[PDB]
Every structure is written in structure tokens, then in C-alpha cells.
């Protein structure tokens, strides 16, 4: 091996600067390995500061390091293992089996970095993805190979929403999936590992139709940044080289943003607005652009986003808001209304909803719904002071319908048989359009409002009407 040896010069948190000797200087974005009783500490080369000294970011805890410690260079950006021998095991930031699956890799490794496909590579899509979740199906239909985006705040049962998607869509889909967790709890981790072993997606006998890359919040901020890149490359290997349809899931990208903001300060970059990195736009951009359906395989990414304190004017959610194809907002208010899905319907916009894409009928039904719900919200203030008085009878029926619709959007989740107890309903998209159409016509205005609440399709709604009637 090349004698690219550097002696550490400054351990100042994650930032560790190395002093490679003259004429043997690494290249920016290389990977340094340092033998330690902690295995090999990996330092990712991120700047040259001249005079044969680089400033690199650590991927592991920098406690108990020695100032002047010899550093070998393995060169280039960290090379993970890729294959279909990456299917079904927990792969840590640097790739190690954190589930003791022993050697991981098929025959190949790939670098953590990869370039985003060029404009020429891009190939337009406009498919459809039925989730069975009625609100999603009617008011913001997803599309296969999409870049679905789960904007929501803290603890919107964010994992739970995703869990429903995995339960239905992943098992259903033939494409491989990669569940990547960036800075999520080991509590959540143990549950997810167990749950997806149970749903059999992770089949511990046969091949798993999913891989896991769990990066947790206990890992250093530096390591947290490069959980994302690692997972992304596994997905790229599927997308490109295996050619397969993918159905990526990543969690949570605020942790990616946040991680980058933290080490930005440490890198010496003067903080930008709301303390975020000045490189915020482009760092996000590199991740987002890399994920795309090209001539090669279709990555059906579902990307979680955490909106700090439900403030969407904050630059970190707001920047992400542009970058994702099919935004969905899961709001606290709606959660509080007891509606799980917590999806805020008027605040969920999708480019995939169109009177051509899903056709005029689907569109028209949803357009009437949107207006109806918006009317109810606008009138809520009138009801607050004025009450039912100088408010039209017609308006009152619309209000009543909106309350019915509001709770018709309420339907349980199968993965909330433990977070509720009523089993979820995968209601066919066409059936949902029809069933909602009926409501708008007022064909079921004899049905109690609460007989729309937390049940499935029209057949179920009628059944719960009867149940309540008794």
C-alpha cells in the first residue's frame, strides 16, 4: 500500500485535521482509515488547508484519540458493499454488519459519492401508485418511480405512516426496497427490525425484498451525514446496475439537513440563515437530483421530512418543499381531530393530480371535495361568533357534508391495530373515487357523521351506520 501517512494534528470534536507528509497528499473526498482499538476510524477528506494538512470529518467518536496518530489513506470516497447480497441485513454507516450477518458484499463495492444523472439521462414518468390510504388516493395520488415526500412535524407518528406504506406497498411491489434510517432511534430501530422480520419482507430464510441501513442519532453528526450517501448508493446499484424497480424509503431528511448544518459550523463555514449551512441548497440538491427515474430503473422514493415545530416558513423544510415531486403534509391539528391519517388535505398538493393524469372524473370528484373542505374551514369563523343564524341552510348542509367527509377521510391503519385496534382498509382507488362521489351527491346524508369516522369504504360506512343505529 501507498505510504500516505498523516499524523493527526488537532482533535477538536468531529473535525480532525491530519498532517500528511510531503508529496503524498490525498485528494478531496478521499477516505482515510486510522487503526484504533475501535476498529478503523474513518475520516472523510473534506478540505485542503494547504501545507500538507487536510481538514477531514470523522465518522466515529473522536474520544481517546492521540494527537499525531498515523493515518493510512484508502483513497476516494468510502466504498460500501453493493449487490443483492446487500438484501436483508442491517448495514451501518461504513457498511459493517450491525446484525452480525458476517461478510456483506456480493462481488462489488461502490463509492458513497455518485454524480446526479444529467438532463439527457432524465426520462419523464407519470405513472400511478395506489396506496389504499383513501386520502392519499383521492386527494393526492402517488405515481410509481416518484419522489413522494412525507412532510410533517415532530411525532406525527411519522414512522407509523411510513410503516403503513411498507406494510402494503412494499410487500405488494416486486421491486426491491431499501429502508434507510438517518438519525432515528434504536427504539424505533428494534421495532422496525422486528416488524419487518414479522411482515416477512425481511425473510430470514429466503432473500429479503428489502435491505436495511440503520443510522441512528447516537452516531456522530459526521457519520449521520454519510448514512444518506451510503443508502443512496445501494439504491443506485439497484436502480442502475441491477436495473430493477426500487421502492426506496429514507428517514428522516431533516436529520440529514441538521447534520450538515452542525458540521458546517465545525468546518468553519460562517452560519447562514437560521443557523443552517450556506451550502444548504446545493447539499440538498445533490441528494435529491441523485434520486431520479432515468432510462435505468425506477426509484420509487418515499422521503420523510420533519418540519421543526410545524413551521414551514423555516428554510430547511421550505427548501425541501420544492425538491420533492409529491408533497403531503401531515398536520398536528388533524391528528388532534383524531384523524389518523393526519394528512391535511388542503395543504397536500401533488403534481400528479390532474384532469388528464388521473382523468377528468377523478379530478372533478376531488375538486368538489377540495372546495367543500375549504368552505367548511372558511365558515368555521362565522360559526364561531355568528353561529347557525345568518348562515345559509345550503351552507349548513355543506358544513354537515364536510364533517362527514372529514371523518370519511378517517380510516384506520393496519399498523395502528397497536396504535388503535381497528384494522386498516386498503380501499381500491377507483372505489374510493366512486364512494366519495356518492357523499358529494348527498346520497349518504342519512348516515351519521361518526358513521364515517375511522372506518373504510362506503360499504363499511353503511355498516357502521347500522352498528351505530343499534
Amino acid at each position: 500500500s501507498t505510504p500516505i501517512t498523516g499524523k493527526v494534528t488537532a482533535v477538536i470534536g468531529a473535525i480532525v485535521d491530519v498532517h500528511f507528509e510531503q508529496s503524498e497528499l490525498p485528494a478531496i473526498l478521499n477516505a482515510l482509515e486510522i487503526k484504533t482499538p475501535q476498529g478503523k476510524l474513518v475520516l472523510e477528506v473534506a478540505q485542503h488547508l494547504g501545507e500538507n494538512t487536510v481538514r477531514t470529518i470523522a465518522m466515529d467518536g473522536t474520544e481517546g484519540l492521540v494527537r499525531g496518530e498515523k493515518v493510512l489513506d484508502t483513497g476516494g470516497p468510502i466504498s460500501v458493499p453493493v449487490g443483492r447480497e446487500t438484501l436483508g441485513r442491517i448495514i451501518n454507516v461504513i457498511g459493517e454488519p450491525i446484525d452480525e450477518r458476517g461478510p456483506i458484499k456480493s462481488k462489488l463495492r461502490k463509492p458513497i459519492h455518485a454524480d446526479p444523472p444529467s438532463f439527457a439521462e432524465q426520462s419523464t414518468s407519470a405513472e400511478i401508485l395506489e396506496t389504499g390510504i383513501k386520502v392519499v388516493d383521492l386527494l393526492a395520488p402517488y405515481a410509481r418511480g416518484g419522489k413522494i415526500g412525507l412532510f410533517g412535524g415532530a411525532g406525527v407518528g411519522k414512522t407509523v405512516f411510513i410503516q403503513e406504506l411498507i406494510n402494503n406497498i412494499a410487500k405488494a411491489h416486486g421491486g426491491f426496497s431499501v429502508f434507510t434510517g438517518v438519525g432515528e432511534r434504536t427504539r424505533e430501530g428494534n421495532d422496525l427490525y422486528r416488524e419487518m422480520k414479522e411482515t416477512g419482507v425481511i425473510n430470514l430464510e429466503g432473500e429479503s425484498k428489502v435491505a436495511l441501513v440503520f443510522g441512528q442519532m447516537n452516531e456522530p453528526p459526521g457519520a449521520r451525514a454519510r448514512v444518506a450517501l451510503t443508502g443512496l448508493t445501494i439504491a443506485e446499484y439497484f436502480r442502475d446496475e441491477e436495473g430493477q424497480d426500487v421502492l426506496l424509503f429514507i428517514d428522516n431528511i431533516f436529520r440529514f439537513t441538521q447534520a450538515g448544518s452542525e458540521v458546517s459550523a465545525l468546518l468553519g463555514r460562517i452560519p447562514s440563515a437560521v443557523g443552517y449551512q450556506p451550502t444548504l441548497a446545493t447539499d440538498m440538491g445533490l441528494l435529491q437530483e441523485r434520486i431520479t427515474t432515468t432510462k435505468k430503473g425506477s426509484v420509487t422514493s418515499v422521503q420523510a421530512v420533519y418540519v421543526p415545530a410545524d413551521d414551514l416558513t423555516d428554510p430547511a423544510p421550505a427548501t425541501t418543499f420544492a425538491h420533492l415531486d409529491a408533497t403531503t403534509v401531515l398536520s398536528r391539528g388533524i391528528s388532534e381531530l383524531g384523524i389518523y391519517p393526519a394528512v391535511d388535505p388542503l395543504d397536500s398538493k401533488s403534481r400528479l393530480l390532474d384532469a388528464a393524469v388521473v382523468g377528468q372524473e377523478h379530478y372533478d370528484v376531488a375538486s368538489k371535495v377540495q372546495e367543500t373542505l375549504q368552505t367548511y374551514k372558511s365558515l368555521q369563523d362565522i360559526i364561531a361568533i355568528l353561529g347557525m343564524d345568518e348562515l345559509s341552510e345550503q351552507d349548513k348542509l355543506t358544513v354537515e357534508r364536510a364533517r362527514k367527509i372529514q371523518r370519511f377521510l378517517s380510516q384506520p391503519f393496519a399498523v395502528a391495530e397497536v396504535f388503535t385496534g381497528i384494522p386498516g382498509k386498503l380501499v381500491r382507488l377507483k372505489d374510493t373515487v366512486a364512494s366519495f362521489k356518492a357523499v358529494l351527491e348527498g346520497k349518504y346524508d342519512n348516515i351519521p357523521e361518526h358513521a364515517f369516522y375511522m372506518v373504510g369504504g362506503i360499504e363499511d360506512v353503511v355498516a357502521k351506520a347500522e352498528k351505530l343505529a343499534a
Binding site: 460562517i270 452560519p271 440563515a273 437560521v274 443557523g275
Partner: protein, 53 residues
């Protein structure tokens, strides 16, 4: 007579309501305006502190 008094009284009341609400608008407006300036100042302090470092 009663109904006429009811409608007459509400007209008087709702007029007086409008005045009282207006005062509250003015008070929260000043608070809003000051607070807006203050947010800018607080952000600036963070920026200066960063620049100094």
C-alpha cells in the same frame, strides 16, 4: 315592541363591538410591528457573533 328592541339593541351593541375590537387591532399591530423588528435584530446578533468568530 320586544323584537324591535332586540334588533335595535344588537345594532347598538355590534357598533360598540367594532370600536372595541379596533382598539385591540391597534394594540396587537404595534406589538406585531415591534416584534417583527426585534426578530430581525435577534437574527442580526447571531450573524454578528458568527462573523466575529
Amino acid at each position: 315592541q320586544g323584537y324591535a328592541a332586540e334588533i335595535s339593541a344588537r345594532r347598538n351593541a355590534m357598533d360598540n363591538a367594532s370600536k372595541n375590537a379596533g382598539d385591540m387591532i391597534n394594540r396587537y399591530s404595534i406589538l406585531y410591528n415591534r416584534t417583527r423588528q426585534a426578530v430581525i435584530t435577534n437574527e442580526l446578533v447571531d450573524i454578528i457573533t458568527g462573523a466575529s468568530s
